[PDB]
């Protein structure tokens, strides 16, 4: 049957898709429910507003169009999830109907109060990715929670800014906030609970989560947050030089006026495909178009906002994969041995030149991070130099910022649960020495192993993978229900382990994997090196 | 005209303790109370953060003038009603609305006082833990009558007469009727 | 039975003392044989000369007098062995007859035909000690080697220098080399072999051993070396500014002339007891009177010399203990918890100030050696700060120089055997958390456990200590016999084969109750001190 | 004349290799050998170290002048009998005494050439490994007659004639008798 439901703007018709598995009930899907007016013409580069009511019944059974993007271009190939850049041809199937009026969202409703809502902020960078890639229907039926997956403006059309009021920027963040507002004031009609809205995302989307915590625009819209593999303080989280890249794009497209408003208007007069398919390359380990520190959405530098405690006590579930810098070591991933000592001194030097570049501390810092990231008991192993390079990139970009944000959130008494993900599905082209890479927790959170391999995830899933997917889905849904991964639904070696909080004095975390155990400190030596010694050099 | 509580000889204090998992942090606050006393120096309501944090909000009478002093992280900002006589034994009502660094104070029907401290100011009152009524531990005991502590929808004086588990009464605080 | 052996200068009479133990045979001790003319008058502050023949038979039974010294004064307590500082009252008994005529050596002949010789170069620092404290008779009777313990000029009278030709310095090293020459030209008469003369020592004496390897004076005198807990490249092994301290001592004594020759001539007039008693305090972790680079005995500073292969292929048996800086953490050894953070950072800052003192690399270096020596997983222990401070001192002063000199010797194709000592005798006043401190391998090498507790070593020795002493003595005597601690006398200790210390793979043996041939001793911290600190 | 050896057409090389445990390092090097040849460009005696070390000693006839060039660590030091001609087919005895940097080269009865190089000089010939006679591998093979190669108390030719276990012969090196 087609269970039409009435919203504050009208009525919409959905479907009743039946799941492959025999332990999951049917899920009602409303695909393509709009939440903001189409920003096509003079509303381009303006914050979104409420939609237009429609008479009669709206017909929502097909996936909405994607936002304009150039997938087959010079994407940032480091920050993207590994499964995205491996199966890039299959990912282009979903981005086929790219249209500017892409502001829609898809709700998956399962069939002990009203069901909680879980909004998903997708993305690997800010210039790619659509919500149709993830079928949030297995997660909805298993956890008895409503799962929402949206589309928001990406890249040039959503984050272009100049610094002044001609184009402030952060249009994607305001689109996400508008979607949260629509959920807050319209989810009770769908059976959801508008006071238990958990918001979660992996990768660049995760950064958006940590920027929606610090925005006063999203005050009472949500209550919890699950930020996995991403922070607001990494090198590629925000854009501190938006004017430079904006002017570069304006010159490339064909109009660069010394007055910002004139150039912005000219860009507004240009077709989306013409200004999206252009190629503007950012500096390495940085972004061209992304969130901008202006004063309305993000008041200050995110590294400074959370040190002074400018957030409203959101329950947090942060996490890190074992090795995520798997694309740092890619030119040497097809060699019998690891990286040579002549090349291990080269990648580190380029790393320092691209991330610090300080004329003073360029020779003392480089030598000390060369000394720290080498196994002195195996100084001439070869492979245990590629491994340490991967560990270096993971520690600098993903582990140290995650632990820093966890400590800053815990020091102001907000419940923080830290997790580490180790297991990974046996892919096709993945090297044997590799481990859980960036974005290799999404299959388990979204219940892919319970429906088998898809075009995006072609690994073969065993019984252990299904058990792990069930466990992590139970953890996530327990968090969305009660704000504590153990309270509502007990586990059914995962049974007897109790997940503890993350106190700054003793940084308890959970080591999610085939052999879980509540450990006590994640890479304490290297995390302390990156947080406490490097600033002194 | 609510649950009026009488202070007596010696002193007294009312304590509201939030549940440890539900300590709220608010960008804006509203503190309303009607009171009647003749003390020249007193501390009526003192709101504290959790352990260690220096975030606090206090309503107090200094030299007879009522005023609100709060610390949100940068500097201690105080807005005080001084152009009136308020401790004359009559029943007065004071409402204080804080929005970020901006403060607004009103007493009875006298015109509102606005305070806009200069510079960039922190806006978030972090992890409120305890509401203290009477100022026994502050050093200025209270001798008078209080009525209607409305604080972000948590009327502590309303629940004080209901013998709530979280409310603590220590001292010679007395309730009419 | 007092056997009489004729030397190249005369005839000496020994004894035939028999040991308390049953398995060990009797020995013959020629305690008191001279090896150089006494430096009383104008021969003071001069290199030693060969002795004068005595007509008749000379009694060699009494322990000869020690060299002038002053223990109950200002001594560097950090570098001295733990057993010397702890039992100082009993140690001062041996040095009671301090006379300027202290050039004597003691032989302990046991009872393939010729026997190996092992000279012992004593001295915890350069101001104190004597050869009489080490009754090298169990080692001689067990391993069937001839142990020789000597006395050499110490402190002011044997190491005073001005840099110029008025006083070249290193009179103690010259006395030791003269004793080695006497052994080389006279040990065949006692049954020993003039072709297998090992020299071994612990503490600053071991430094002498290393300084005896780079000196062209001792070219063919000896053939091996066993340097334990000592190096010639550490901070307190060579005096680099002797003129300053010599001038301070000259001013303190009573004559400080601008002319070095006149000052030395005035000093020679003073009594041997006047200039010994005066104190001359050096900077922390340094020495005042000690070996001086002059070009005669030590051509250049030892660090440079061993870089450019200026040694003559001497087999080496180097080693260290687990914790030797036990006196670095002494003011905090009587507390409920360990060193607090405010005190840990203060001790590290004082360490850096006293040892490096570089104005530029001051806060970069202190921060990184603070970060390296702290367990971050258990950061706030308090007690695991004493352990890291002790490990920091041990690593800087004893382990890093030992590994550096082992690599430098092994890089020029000369055998090096590296050992690490862990088991220590259970004393009375030693803390439970402590471990084998400086000079705690000396009871085992000299076979104290096989005779029992003495005044200098008041522990008891159980069966484990006796077994370990037997094992260590077997290793040392095998090295003396053949330059390989495994060949002649086979021995948990039977399956272990001691391997050469190769620079590429730093193999070593882990002497203790549970021995094992390990692979890299503290690779992280040693690499820190040798390859990162020079870059800051 | 001692145990004379003759080098035929094409030449050859005779090699004495120290055991890997008994490689001698020596401060003072002594060489002495009699020879008879008419060659102009050849290398006779080659002393090398083990792997890595740059220490070596060479005896060579260049431009009709016999000389010795040794590297002890600082630089190559060469001393040649320039003021004479030696390759006249007669029996000439050459000796060479080394002391660190100082070198004395003597031939027959002609006055000894002395060399005292300036500056800081290394002295130790570290870890001598093999002694080479013939110089075929160097690039200047030798063809003539040799007798009694004295090298620090090692009568190399005599022990080679005695057929020791540490001496090897290759090429056209032949015994006289
Ligand atoms: C929903 O819409 C499609 C196309 O807009 C239409 O073909 C279909 O019949 C609709 N579903 C109904 C009317 O149930
Ligand atoms: C699944 O298993 C088959 C057969 O072993 C293998 O060829 C294929 O690559 C596997 N696929 C994945 C992603 O595991
Ligand atoms: C405080 O007042 C100023 C002046 O109108 C205003 O710009 C600012 O937004 C106010 N702050 C808050 C937190 O309301
Ligand atoms: C040696 O000692 C004996 C007694 O022990 C004594 O009679 C004799 O005079 C001594 N001779 C010398 C030369 O000291
Ligand atoms: C040595 O003294 C300790 C003191 O506790 C004791 O435990 C041990 O048994 C003693 N050993 C002998 C052999 O007396
Ligand atoms: C070379 O001769 C000079 C002349 O006195 C001498 O000083 C020097 O020590 C000699 N070189 C060596 C290595 O002995
Ligand atoms: Ca605050
Ligand atoms: Ca050399």
Q: What is C219-231 written as a DSSP string?
A: SSS--EEEEES--
Nearest to A178 by CA among A318, A34, A302: A34
Residue A131 backbone dihedrals phi, psi, to 5 degrees: -75, -15
Q: How far apart are CA B79 and CA C399, in angstroms?
A: 66
Ligand 8 centroid, distance to D73 Cα (angstroms): 4
Beta bridge partners, C420, equal: C320, C510
Contact C413 D21 (CB under 8 A): no
Q: Are A29 and A106 in contact (CB under 8 A)?
A: yes
Closest by Cα among C534, C286, C231, C235 to C407: C231
Burial of C17 (0-12, 13-18, 19+ CB in 10 A): middle
Nearest Cα to C466, choosing from C452, C455, C486, C478?
A: C452
Rounded to the nearest angstrom, the distance between the alpha carbon of C307 and the centre of ligand 2 is 57
Ligand 2 pocket, residue A62 CB under 6 Å: no
Q: What is the CA radius of gyration of chain C?
A: 23
The beta-strand segments (E) located in C7-89 are 11-13, 27-29, 33-34, 57-59
Query: Does residue C224 share a domain with residue C138?
Result: yes
Q: Are the beta carbons of C313 and D23 closer than 8 angstroms?
A: yes
CA dihedral (C237, C242, C245, C250) positive or negative: positive
CA distances from D16 to D47, D132, D159 (A): 10, 7, 10
**Contact, A506 vs A330, CB < 8 A?**
no
B vs A contact (3+ beta-carbon pairs below 8 A): yes
Sorted by sequence, the CB contacts under 8 Å of residue C382 that are 6+ apart come out as C337, C338, C339, C340
Q: Apex CA C82: angle with CA C426 and CA C472, to 5°? A: 60
- Pocket-testing residue among A4, A11, A30, A59, ligand 1, by greatest number of atoms within 8 A of Cβ: A59
CB pairs < 8 Å spanning A and C? 49
Nearby residues of B103 by Cβ (< 8 Å), 6 or more positions away:
B68, B70, B77, B79, B96, B97, B114, B115
d(CA B3, CA B5) in angstroms, rounded, equals 6
Q: Residue C476 has which token pair? A: 């040392």
- DSSP lists the bridge partners of residue C117 as C146, C197
Which residues sit opposite A41 in a β-bridge?
Answer: none
Element (H, E) at A392: helix A383-394
The DSSP bridge partners found for residue A200 are A120, A226
Q: In angstroms, how far is CA A252 from the centroid of its own chain?
A: 30
Same domain, yes or no: C349 and C211 = no
| Nearest ligand to residue D99 Cα | 6
Q: Does the CB atom of residue B82 touch ligand 3 within 6 A?
A: no
Report CA-CA distances (Å) from C101 to A254, C31, C34, C123. Answer: 100, 15, 10, 18
The strand order across the sheet containing C57-59 reads C4-6, C11-13, C57-59
Answer for the pair C19, C451: CB distance below 8 angstroms, yes or no: yes
CB contacts under 8 A, C 487-516 vs D, are none
Using alpha carbons, select from C125, C131, C91 the residue that is nearest to residue C108: C131
Q: What is the Cα–Cα distance from A338 to A331, expressed in whole angstroms?
A: 11
* Residue C307 sits at the chain D interface (C-beta within 8 Å): no
Q: Are C409 and C401 in contact (CB under 8 A)?
A: no
Kind of pairing between the strands at A510-512 and A416-421: parallel
Give the C-alpha separation, B6 to A328, whole Å: 70
Ligand 4: residue whose CA is nearest its atom 9: C59
The reply to whether A343 falls in a domain is no
**Are the C-beta atoms of residues D91 and D98 closer than 8 Å to each other?**
no
Q: Are C83 and C107 in contact (CB under 8 A)?
A: no
Beta bridge partners of B105: B96, B113
* DSSP 8-class letter at A338: -
Q: For the residues of C350-373, what is the DSSP string, one character each? A: HHHHHHT--SSSSHHHHHHHHHHT
Task: Tell how far the Cα of B102 is from the centroid of ligand 3, in angstroms.
Answer: 6
How far apart CA D150 and CA D153 sit, in angstroms, is: 6
C-alpha C425 chain-centroid distance: 20
- Asked if C67 and C55 count as a contact pair (C-beta separation under 8 A), the reply is no
Please check if D72 is assigned to a binding site.
yes
Method underlying the structure: cryo-EM
Distances from the Cα of A345 to the Cαs of A352, A354, A357, A369, in angstroms?
11, 14, 16, 10
Other beta carbons within 10 angstroms of residue C491's beta carbon come to 14
Quick check: CB of C464 below 6 Å from ligand 5?
A: no
Q: Does residue B67 contact residue B60 with C-beta atoms inside 8 Å?
A: yes
Residue A465: inside a domain, yes or no?
Answer: yes
* Closest Cα in chain A, distance from residue C427 (Å): 35
Contact B35, B146 (CB under 8 A): yes
Does the annotation place B48 within a ligand binding site? Answer: no
Q: How far is the CA of A296 from the centre of ligand 3 (A)?
A: 12
Q: Does A521 reach chain C within 8 Å, measured CB to CB?
A: yes
D77 closest CA partner among D122, D117, D113, D45: D117
Which residue is associated with the tokens 């991403």? A230
**Euclidean distance between CA atoms A30 and A7, whole angstroms:** 12
* A374 and A388 Cβ atoms separated by less than 8 Å: yes
Nearest-Cα residue of chain C relative to residue D73? C308
What is d(CA C484, CA D97) in angstroms, rounded to the nearest whole number?
34
Contact between A112 and A480 under an 8 Å Cβ cutoff? The reply is: no
CA angle D53, D57, D61 (to 5 degrees): 145
The alpha carbon of residue C358 is apart from the nearest alpha carbon of chain D, in Å, by: 29
* For ligand 4, atom 4: residue with the closest CA: C59
Q: How far apart are CA C396 and CA C347, in angstroms?
A: 14
- The answer to whether A522 contacts chain C (CB < 8 Å) is no
Q: Rounded CA gap, A112 and A473, in Å?
A: 18
CATH number at residue A502: 3.40.50.1820
CB contact at 8 A, C495 and C368: no
Q: Domains in chain D and their CATH numbers?
A: 4-175 (2.60.120.200)
Give the other-Cβ count within 10 Å of D142's Cβ.
25
Whether residue C502 is contained in a domain is answered as yes
Is residue C334 in some structural domain?
Answer: no
**For residue A54, how far is the Cα from the chain centroid?**
33
d(C-alpha C231, C-alpha C397), whole Å: 9
In a domain, residue C333? The reply is: no
Query: Within 13 A of A276's CA, how many CA atoms are on the CB side?
Result: 21
Question: What's the burial of A14, exposed, middle or buried (CB within 10 Å: 0-12/13-18/19+)?
Answer: buried
- Measured over the CA atoms of residue A309, residue A313, residue A314 and residue A316, the dihedral's sign is positive
Query: Is D57 strand, coil or helix?
Result: strand
- DSSP annotation string for C466-500: HHHHHHHHHHHHHHHHHSSTTSSS----SS-----
Tally of residues, chain A: 537
In 10 A of CB A328, how many CB atoms? 21
Contact assessment for residue A385 and residue A317, using Cβ atoms and an 8 Å cutoff: no
* Alpha-carbon dihedral sign for residues C70, C72, C78, C80: positive
Q: CB-based contacts of B65: which residues, under 8 Å, 6+ apart?
A: B80, B81, B82, B84, B86
DSSP B47: E
C207 and C348, same structural domain? no
For chain B, what is the total number of helices (H) and then of strands (E)?
1, 14
- How far apart are the CA of C84 and the centre of ligand 5, in A? 22
Q: Which one of D97, D98, D102 would you pick to mutate in the ligand 6 pocket, going by the greatest count of ligand atoms within 8 A of its CB?
A: D102
Cα C359–chain centre separation: 33
Whose CA is closest to A512, among A531, A488, A491?
A491
User: Count of CB atoms within 10 A of residue A299's CB?
Assistant: 17
- A491: number of Cβ within 10 Å: 17
Instruction: Report the C-alpha gap between A263 and A249 in whole angstroms.
Output: 11
Contact between C308 and D73 using a beta-carbon 8 Å cutoff: yes
Rounded CA separation A94/A84 (Å): 12
Tokens for C463, please give them. Answer: 């069966």
Give the span between the Cα atoms of A366 and D45, in whole angstroms. Answer: 49
Q: Is B108 annotated as a binding residue?
A: no
Dihedrals phi, psi of D136, to nearest 5 degrees? -75, -40
Say which residue the tokens 């391999």 belong to: A453
The residue whose CA has the least distance to atom 8 of ligand 6 is: D102
Q: Alpha helices of B37-150 — where are they, by DSSP H? A: none
Q: Say if residue A29 is exposed, middle or buried (CB neighbours under 10 Å; 0-12, 13-18, 19+).
A: buried
Residue A27 to residue A138: CA distance in whole angstroms: 8
| Distance, C-alpha C62 to centroid of its chain | 25
User: CA-to-CA distance for C315 and A313, rounded, in angstroms?
Assistant: 69
Edge to edge, the sheet with strand B102-107 lists: B113-115, B102-107, B92-99, B28-37, B144-151, B5-6, B174-175
How far apart CA B120 and CA C230 sit, in angstroms, is: 62
Kindly list the protein residues that place their beta carbon closer than 5 angstroms to ligand 8, a single-atom ion: C 309; D 55, 73, 122, 124, 126
A334: its two tokens? 């097809």
Range A193-213 burial, b when 16+ CB lie within 10 A, else e: bbebbbbbbbbbbbbbbbbbb
Pair C281, C385 in one domain: no
* 3-class secondary structure, A34: strand
- Quote the DSSP letter at residue A42: T
Q: Could you give the CA distance from residue C368 to residue C346 in angstroms, rounded to a whole number?
A: 14
Instruction: Let me know if chains A and C touch, i.e. at least 3 Cβ pairs under 8 angstroms.
Output: yes
Inter-residue contact D32 to D93 (CB < 8 Å): yes
Return the H-helix or E-strand segment holding C304: helix C302-307
| Nearest-angstrom CA–CA distance, B81 and C478 | 95
CA-closest residue to ligand 6 atom 6: D102
- The number of folded domains in chain A is 1
Interface of D with C (CB under 8 A): 21, 23-27, 50, 52-53, 55, 73, 122-124, 126-127
Q: Is D158 marked as a binding-site residue?
A: no
Q: Which residues sit opposite B71 in a β-bridge?
A: B56, B76
3-state secondary structure of A118: strand
Cross-strand partners of A108: A29, A147
CA distance A297 to A311: 13
Are B55 and B72 contacting, i.e. CB atoms less than 8 angstroms apart? yes
CA C161 – CA C70 distance, rounded (Å) = 20
CB C228 within 8 A of CB C204: no
3-state secondary structure of D60: strand
Answer yes or no: do C245 and C380 share one domain. Answer: no
Which two structure tokens, joined as six digits, stand for C145? 């080697």
B100 lines ligand 3 (CB under 6 A): yes
Domain co-membership, C300 together with C216: yes
The finding on whether C59 has its CB within 6 A of some atom of ligand 4 is yes
Asked if residues C403 and C521 have their Cβ atoms less than 8 Å apart, the reply is: yes
Do A13 and A2 meet the contact criterion of CB atoms below 8 Å apart? Answer: yes
Q: Following CA atoms A121, A126, A127, A130 in sequence, which dihedral angle do they give, to the nearest 10 degrees?
A: 0
Is C224 among the domain residues?
yes
Give the residue whose CA is nearest to atom 4 of ligand 6: D116
Torsion A515-A516-A517-A523 (CA) sign: positive
Strands C224-228 and A5-7: unpaired
DSSP letters for B33-44: EEEEE--SSEEE
Token pair for A461: 């899933």
For residue C336, tell me if it sits in a domain. Answer: no
| CA A31 to ligand 1 center in whole angstroms | 13
Query: Do the chains contact at C308 and D23, CB–CB below 8 Å?
Result: no
Residue C486 structural domain? 4-327+398-526
The string of DSSP codes covering C401-436 is HHHHHHHHHHTTS--EEEEEE------SSS-TT--S
Q: How many CB atoms lie within 10 A of CB A30?
A: 23
Q: What would you report as the CA-atom Rg of chain A, rounded to the nearest whole angstrom?
A: 23
> Looking at the structure, do residues C388 and C410 belong to the same domain, yes or no?
no
Within 10 A of A486 (CB to CB), how many other CB atoms are there?
Answer: 17
Q: Which two tokens mark D116?
A: 């005292």
Helices then strands, counting H and E runs in chain C, come out as 17, 14
Interface A–B counts its CB contacts (< 8 A) at 35
CA atoms C75, C77, C78, C82: torsion sign = positive
* Alpha carbons C173 and C47: distance in angstroms, whole number: 9
| Nearest chain B residue to A305, by CA | B122
What residues 367-406 of chain A have any CB closer than 8 A to a CB of chain C?
A: 367-368, 371, 376-377, 379-380
Going by C-alpha positions, the residue among D79, D126, D84, D131 that lies closest to residue D103 is D79
Cα dist from B174 to B6, B34, B46, whole Å: 5, 16, 19
In a domain, A537, yes or no: no
CA nearest to C526 within chain A: A376
Q: How far apart are CA C308 and CA C412, in angstroms?
A: 10
| Neighbours, chain A (3 or more CB pairs < 8 A) | B, C
CA angle A139, A225, A459 (to 5 degrees): 40
Nearest to A373, CA basis, from A392, A390, A346, A400? A392
Residue from A56, A61, A65 whose mutation best tests the ligand 1 pocket (most atoms within 8 A of CB):
A61
Interacting residues of A232 by C-beta distance below 8 A, sequence separation 6+: A207, A210, A211, A214, A238, A302, A303, A306, A405
Phi and psi at residue A238, to the nearest 5° = -130, 175
Buried b (16+ CB within 10 A) or exposed e, A404-417: bbbbbbbbbbbbbb
Strand B144-151 with B5-6, pairing = antiparallel
Reduce the DSSP state of residue B66 to 3 states and report it. Answer: strand
Closest listed ligand to the CA of A57: 1
Q: Do chains D and B touch (3 or more CB pairs under 8 A)?
A: no
Rounded CA separation C203/C460 (Å):
23
């Amino acid at each position: 049957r087609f269970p039409v439901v009435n919203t504050a703007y009208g009525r919409v018709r959905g479907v009743r898709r039946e799941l492959n598995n025999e332990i999951l009930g049917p899920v009602v899907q409303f695909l393509g429910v709009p939440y903001a007016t189409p920003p096509l013409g003079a509303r381009r580069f303006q914050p979104p507003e409420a939609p237009a009511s429609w008479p009669g019944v709206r017909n929502a059974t097909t996936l909405p169009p994607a936002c304009p993007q150039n997938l087959h271009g010079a994407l940032p190939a480091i920050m993207l999830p590994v499964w995205f850049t491996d199966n890039l041809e299959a990912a282009a199937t979903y981005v086929q109907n790219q249209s500017e009026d892409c502001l829609y969202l898809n709700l998956y409703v399962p069939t002990s109060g009203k069901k909680p809502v879980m909004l998903f902020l997708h993305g690997g960078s800010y210039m790619e990715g659509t919500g149709n890639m993830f079928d949030g229907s297995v997660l909805a039926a298993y956890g008895n929670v409503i799962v929402v997956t949206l589309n928001y403006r990406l890249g040039v059309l959503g984050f272009l800014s100049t610094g002044d009021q001609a184009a402030k920027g952060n249009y994607g963040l305001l689109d996400q906030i508008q979607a949260l507002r629509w959920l807050s004031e319209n989810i009770a009609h769908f059976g959801g609970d508008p006071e238990r809205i958990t918001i979660f995302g992996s990768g660049a989307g995760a950064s958006c989560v940590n920027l929606l915590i610090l925005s006063h625009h999203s005050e009472g819209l949500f209550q919890k947050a699950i930020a996995q593999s991403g922070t607001a303080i990494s090198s590629w989280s925000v854009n501190y030089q938006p004017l430079k890249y904006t002017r570069l794009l304006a010159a490339k497209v064909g109009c660069d006026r010394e007055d910002s408003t004139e150039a912005v208007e000219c860009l507004r007069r240009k077709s989306s495909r013409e200004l999206v398919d252009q190629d503007v390359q950012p500096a390495r380990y940085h972004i061209a178009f992304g969130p901008v520190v202006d004063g309305d959405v993000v008041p200050d530098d995110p590294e400074i906002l959370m040190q002074q405690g400018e957030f409203l006590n959101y329950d947090m579930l942060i996490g890190v994969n074992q090795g995520e810098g798997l694309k740092f070591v890619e030119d040497s991933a097809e060699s019998e041995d690891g990286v040579s000592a002549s090349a291990f001194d080269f990648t580190v030097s380029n790393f320092v030149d691209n991330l610090y570049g300080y004329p003073e501390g360029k020779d003392v810092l480089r030598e000390t991070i060369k000394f720290m990231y080498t196994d002195w008991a195996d100084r001439d192993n070869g492979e245990m130099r590629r491994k340490t390079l991967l560990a270096l990139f993971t520690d600098h970009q993903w582990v140290a910022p995650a632990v820093a944000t966890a400590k800053l959130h815990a020091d102001y008494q907000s419940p923080v649960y830290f997790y580490t993900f180790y297991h990974h599905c046996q892919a096709e082209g993945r090297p044997e020495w590799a481990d859980a890479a960036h974005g290799d927790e999404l299959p388990y959170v979204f219940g892919v192993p319970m429906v088998g391999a898809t075009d995006l995830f072609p690994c073969n899933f065993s019984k252990n993978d299904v058990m792990l997917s069930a466990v992590v889905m139970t953890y996530w849904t327990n968090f969305a229900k009660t704000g504590d991964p153990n309270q509502p639904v007990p586990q059914d070696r995962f049974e007897e382990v109790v997940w503890s909080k993350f106190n700054s004095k003793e940084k308890q975390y959970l080591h999610i994997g085939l052999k879980p155990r509540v450990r006590d400190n994640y890479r304490a030596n290297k995390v302390a090196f990156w947080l406490e010694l490097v600033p002194h050099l | 005209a609510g649950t009026t509580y009488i202070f007596s000889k010696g002193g007294g204090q009312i304590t509201y303790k939030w549940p440890p998992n539900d300590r709220p942090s608010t960008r804006a606050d509203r503190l309303a109370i009607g009171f009647s006393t003749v003390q020249k120096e007193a501390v009526l309501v003192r709101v504290d953060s959790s352990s260690g944090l220096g975030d606090y909000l206090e309503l107090h009478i200094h030299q007879g003038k009522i005023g609100v002093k709060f610390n949100v992280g940068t500097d201690d900002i105080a807005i005080e009603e001084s152009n009136a006589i308020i401790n004359d034994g009559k029943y007065h009502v004071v409402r204080f609305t804080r929005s970020g660094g901006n403060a607004t104070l009103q007493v009875d029907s006298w015109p509102v006082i606005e305070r806009y401290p200069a510079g960039r100011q922190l806006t978030i009152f972090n992890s409120q833990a305890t509401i203290i009524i009477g100022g026994k531990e502050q050093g200025q005991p209270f001798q008078g009558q209080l009525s209607g502590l409305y604080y972000n929808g948590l009327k502590v004086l309303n629940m004080a007469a209901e013998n709530d588990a979280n409310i603590a009464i220590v001292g010679n605080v007395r309730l009419v009727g």
